[PDB]
């Protein structure tokens, strides 16, 4: 159970555990400039909130 933009947005059983789960809203957008990059919009970090 992982709401985006609030507490518990990213979770794992331990700090060094490779089983890391998250449901933060990442939306990748088409590049509007003639260069290479990955434009993306993301929800604010729920730990910071």
């Amino acid at each position: 159970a992982m709401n985006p933009g609030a507490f518990g947005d990213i979770q794992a059983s331990s700090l060094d555990a490779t089983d890391i789960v998250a449901r933060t809203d990442i939306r990748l957008l088409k590049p509007s400039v003639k260069n290479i990059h990955v434009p993306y919009t993301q929800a604010v970090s729920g730990y910071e909130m």
């Binding site: 400039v33 260069n35 290479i36």
Partner: protein
């Protein structure tokens, strides 16, 4: 296998939105991330050039 053999690693040209001429360019120095969680105000900057 974390290494310190930096002789076989390479700095790269980064693409960043603000430059000297106030437009996005390919700069040798490009800030990828900035980390600010120290309790004295010190920040850690990851730059696309090896320093």
């Amino acid at each position: 296998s974390i290494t310190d053999d930096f002789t076989l690693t390479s700095p790269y040209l980064g693409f960043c939105p603000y430059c000297r001429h106030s437009a996005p360019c390919f700069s040798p120095i490009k800030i990828e991330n900035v980390w600010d969680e120290s309790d004295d105000g010190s920040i850690r900057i990851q730059v696309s050039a090896q320093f």
